[PDB]
Design a protein around this nucleic acid. Sequence first.
RNA 1: AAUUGAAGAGUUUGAUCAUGGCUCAGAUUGAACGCUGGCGGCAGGCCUAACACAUGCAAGUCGAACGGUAACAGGAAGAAGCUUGCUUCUUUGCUGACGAGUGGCGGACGGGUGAGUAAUGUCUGGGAAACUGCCUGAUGGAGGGGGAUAACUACUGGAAACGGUAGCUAAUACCGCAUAACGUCGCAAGACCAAAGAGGGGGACCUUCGGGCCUCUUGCCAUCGGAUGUGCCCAGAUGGGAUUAGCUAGUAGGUGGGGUAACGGCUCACCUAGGCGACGAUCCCUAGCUGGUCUGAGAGGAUGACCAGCCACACUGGAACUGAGACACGGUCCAGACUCCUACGGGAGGCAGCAGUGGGGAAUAUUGCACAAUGGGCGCAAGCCUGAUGCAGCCAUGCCGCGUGUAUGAAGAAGGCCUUCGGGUUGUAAAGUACUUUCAGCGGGGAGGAAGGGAGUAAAGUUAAUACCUUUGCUCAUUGACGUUACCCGCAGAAGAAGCACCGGCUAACUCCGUGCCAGCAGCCGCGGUAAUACGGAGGGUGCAAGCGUUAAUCGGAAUUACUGGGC
Lengths: 509, 205, 62, 85
Amino acid sequence: DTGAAAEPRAPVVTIMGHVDHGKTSLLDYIRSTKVASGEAGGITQHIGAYHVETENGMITFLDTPGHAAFTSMRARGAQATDIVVLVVAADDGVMPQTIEAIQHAKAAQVPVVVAVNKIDKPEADPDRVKNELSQYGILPEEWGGESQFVHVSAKAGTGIDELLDAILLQAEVLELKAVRKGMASGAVIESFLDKGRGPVATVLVREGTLHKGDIVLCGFEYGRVRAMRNELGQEVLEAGPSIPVEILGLSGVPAAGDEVTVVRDEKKAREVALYRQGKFREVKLARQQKSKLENMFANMTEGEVHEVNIVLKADVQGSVEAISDSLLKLSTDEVKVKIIGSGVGGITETDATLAAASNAILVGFNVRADASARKVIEAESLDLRYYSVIYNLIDEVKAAMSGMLSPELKQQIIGLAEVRDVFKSPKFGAIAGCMVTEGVVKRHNPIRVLRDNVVIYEGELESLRRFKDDVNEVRNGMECGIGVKNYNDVRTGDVIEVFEIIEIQRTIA
Amino acid sequence: ARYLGPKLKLSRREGTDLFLKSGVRAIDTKCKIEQAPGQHGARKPRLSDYGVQLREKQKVRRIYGVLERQFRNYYKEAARLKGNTGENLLALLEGRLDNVVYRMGFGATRAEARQLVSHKAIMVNGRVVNIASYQVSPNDVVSIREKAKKQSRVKAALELAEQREKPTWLEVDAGKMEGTFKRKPERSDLSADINEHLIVELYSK
Amino acid sequence: VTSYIGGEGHNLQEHSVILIRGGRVKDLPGVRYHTVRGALDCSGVKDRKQARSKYGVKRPKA
Amino acid sequence: NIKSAKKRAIQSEKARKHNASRRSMMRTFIKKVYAAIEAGDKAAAQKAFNEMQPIVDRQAAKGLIHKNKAARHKANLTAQINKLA
RNA sequence: AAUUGAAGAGUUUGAUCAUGGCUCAGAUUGAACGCUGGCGGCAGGCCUAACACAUGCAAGUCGAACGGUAACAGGAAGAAGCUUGCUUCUUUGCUGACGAGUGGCGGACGGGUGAGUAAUGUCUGGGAAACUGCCUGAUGGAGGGGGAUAACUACUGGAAACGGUAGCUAAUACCGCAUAACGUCGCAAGACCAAAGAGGGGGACCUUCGGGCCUCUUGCCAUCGGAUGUGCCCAGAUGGGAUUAGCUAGUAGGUGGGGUAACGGCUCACCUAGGCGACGAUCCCUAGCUGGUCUGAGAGGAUGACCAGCCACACUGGAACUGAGACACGGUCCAGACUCCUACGGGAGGCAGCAGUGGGGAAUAUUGCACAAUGGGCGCAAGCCUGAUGCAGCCAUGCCGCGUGUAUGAAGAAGGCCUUCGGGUUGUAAAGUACUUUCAGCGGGGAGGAAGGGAGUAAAGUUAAUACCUUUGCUCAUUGACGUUACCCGCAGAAGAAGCACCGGCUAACUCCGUGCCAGCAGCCGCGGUAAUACGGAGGGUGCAAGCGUUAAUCGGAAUUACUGGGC
Ligand SMILES: Nc1nc2c(ncn2[C@@H]2O[C@H](COP(=O)(O)OP(=O)(O)NP(=O)(O)O)[C@@H](O)[C@H]2O)c(=O)[nH]1
């Protein structure tokens, strides 16, 4: 990074909102692709960057879905981009997910331009959007707050001409700083694991430069680049600070995002990469000692000790950190759920072994079973379930938890009976003659023996016998007989209370 | 592949003059030699039968300044060579370039002789030699080059080199600042106090 | 198979797969192995100075 | 994989189809020889023998029958016809 | 001158001597982990999942076999924007060349793998019943004709892959005729079988003026040899188990027929009742074998990475074709599993090639550079292709060398540690003083791996010829991936570079403090329950060094499977 060379670049733009403002539609129409609703779920659960060539100059587009679950993706996408776009619908207005995107725009000090998505529907009006978002300091219009609004059809494909112009201008009015040659650096969009290609990452390069021989260092991972891939293009020789290019040949799957810096030699970068691992490992053992010692007692003070374990491996690195945060949101005091051994991709022997030791569900956002993986899963009793969307996953884990509960909320008496004129039996030691005043007496239902309102003894009936009949059930106001083991003293005037036991069941929330 | 620590601790632990402190002065006078090998060295000199076998090897290694792995090759080379195995051990060690540089009086000490040989200032038969473990054979002439000639390091060594034994197996010369290896040193000309039978034993088990 | 944990104290339990060096020392009947310290997820011995090679203790900055 | 010797495959197919027709005719001339050996016809056996003699030696010179396989037919079939004859 | 070399210790008992197991000192490894880490050279580097794979590359090459212009490189011709010296854009195979197609040869070599296989294997020593491209030696043919075809046009079926119908065209493609022993088949007489031209040039009788013809080189055909490879047979040797003792119908042998390049139950018909086996058949379990590797005094034991020989295998299972050679790693088909493409009718694909990824596992690599060299493939040659190979990158994996200073230096400093507080020890260690600059960093110079090949000449060979061509001289241009090479010279300054185990005995190397059968150590016998040289820390010390330990592995010790070399 020497020479202080300043060259203009294509602005990187991210788009945020409440789900359903047709945020994806804006991109696909510009891209003339329409990959929307071609994928499972009908919505975009993943992040990607796509550069297009349109007058004037060059521009690239980045998009992140807006959901309660993706706390991290929208936070990282804002700070990386020079310009942020916020989609808003006149029918939808403002929503708590959209205001969440407002904070990401201001805290990242990134200038913002917006577009009205629906001009097609007659019940949709712009004035509603402007005024209601007026209250918030963001999105002023012609009040001297320099922000500009755009009205697009998004289905109609109507300009757009204005939105595009604003974006170009907004990037034009601010000085665009970059360099064509120098020390390469940037951030990682999304990383995942491939079977043939190996571990890969999608990287935005702040300073644009690359070469097959150049050594690159991402986080605590290091390595030489074997090949370069850009979008549909299978191979690219050179990559500029503007257009993003998937990086390949790194040692292992890096963090979901971080700062990446190339180096001259790999040997010099080996010690640095190992140094970052030591710190990350030291804090790992540090946070491990605290959480265990935090209770300051050998066990839990109450009965919440019952827990459920899960095993998760997702193909993409961006999800495992992001959805886990949303997976810890559904956690409750009663039933505690924890993730064990989050994977970078697929499935493996040591992963199936991990679920073998402790009973757990093995789930993946997207995964396929390995040849060696099937043998283990099919042999021992386990469960392999893969889910296209995170919503179907977040629901069933809760379901697993709700079932775990075992609550019986009813201890209603089945019958109440008073005993009189005790008889002697060899087997039980006593038979207390009874007369049921209320309800029906049953065999295996538990009883409460009490005298003078206090309980002298407790137990469960072993034998209910009237005469030589030995019937299993006795109604009220019918002469009845009773005996039980481990009850020594039968006195008249006391009353025995029999009660059935039932379980209400439980739900999670 | 060098010691670098205190040279007199090696002399003290053996309890014999290794000629590492020689240089300008000689014959110790002030010493503290033996007497406290360690902090509890004033304890009695009673020692095992196995330990005196190892103690001999350390004496020969600490004189010439050789490591156990490099020194393992000299027993292996001396054993395969004909005649007495003990006589061949010290003969191969006596044929080292650092030591032949030390015997002629170019270096004032054995470490200093390895020091000067490392810097490519010693030339055998005209050609320069870096390695101190270079094996010197009969009719080999060894000398200091024109660069760094007549320096106070080499000059002071050759001055006080006349006061030592003055070995017969090589010519001192020191007129034009050169030397010659006449023939292989005899058993009587070396060894005496250092025994070869004790060091040769240790490798058998 | 059962395995001995060397050193004073440990953070090992339940999950987090550990390395096992092996070798037999006889004290608790049945033990034929030893766990490795400072390998994979296993912590080394804290506040140890002599014998750092054993028990996975790193050299402190002096 | 589209690679090198797919030209040789169609050549080996053409050579198979060529040699299969020439080996089939060659044998059907040998099939007429034992038609007279199984019967009691001495002249027809020698007639079919002198018909196979030009064609079978021509195959060995071409390099399809492989020398001695051609010569072994005439070696045995000379011994067959003159048992009764 | 050459397989000239042999170690023990600890532990049964109150103590002793035998007997006898366990344990340790040694060397070694395709290693890993823990801690630490400067450089260089050489070698090594998926030992588990013969589990499966993205992508590029891993075999093409001849216009000197042949019809040809599909490319762009010229030249030529023409038409134009014009500057009067040129570009521009259509024609022409004239040519340096060359897409596709026919043909030739190589895809049977090289590379990889250790799944099978306890004997169609391997090693060793023999034998007879065979073939063998390219390459060589020997003696003769290379005469004269015919009918097709891909390519390319006319259509048409396809989504793609890949065809269909009807024309046209060359050849070193193919098929008849003639030619026919030294060969094949026969007692013999006889019968019977082959082919191809291309390129260099040229005086002479000469062309339907293609070229005959002469001559040079190359190739084809036939037979007899050489060499090389390969097929096949015999003997011996080559794992464990008797808690497997009976095992075999093509089984053992014959005759006749067929079969193979070739002997043969190789495969049939018939006939006879044999065959193998206690010298271990058969069955079961495990395994490539060998030169060797490791250990050992030797005898032996264990082992079969890298290097080289032989064999088998090429997603699984089975079969054939082409060809001299394959029952074919990147060839064909069929079936199975798997993956990709699709218009859903149907196709395509096989990293146990080099890199690389998923996955296994404690763990083993760069999606590199070059055909500069060496050896292959093709060609007359240029030259093309060559993940073989030569190199580099990566990791201390191993082995070997070198550095991390040297000399001086008592105040035996300070500080730490111990102390009977006298002192000792760390300790010539440090600092200080005086020297040197290897290997690194920086700046210069500069071998070898490199002979050929290419273009002109000179002479001698071939010849009707001073053409041409081959060989041998001479002279002129060159061709290095590695490579900021190896090596050498200069510059600056002790500057940039030492850790690890262990110290109760075995076993080289000891006190204090803390803890008090607690926490821990440990290879064996054992230490710790308030003086621990056995734990933990400290000081000191020893061993060893960019390595040091632990663990695992095999031998040694083990005369404890003892043939050498033991008992009852
Ligand atoms: N009427 C109308 N509908 C529109 C318009 N633009 C988009 N839509 C609707 O929006 C839907 C597509 O939404 P989409 O872009 O996938 O939403 P999203 O960007 O994935 N949401 P998130 O970012 O939270 O994941 C379509 O079904 C379409 O009906 C428009 O201009 N008019």
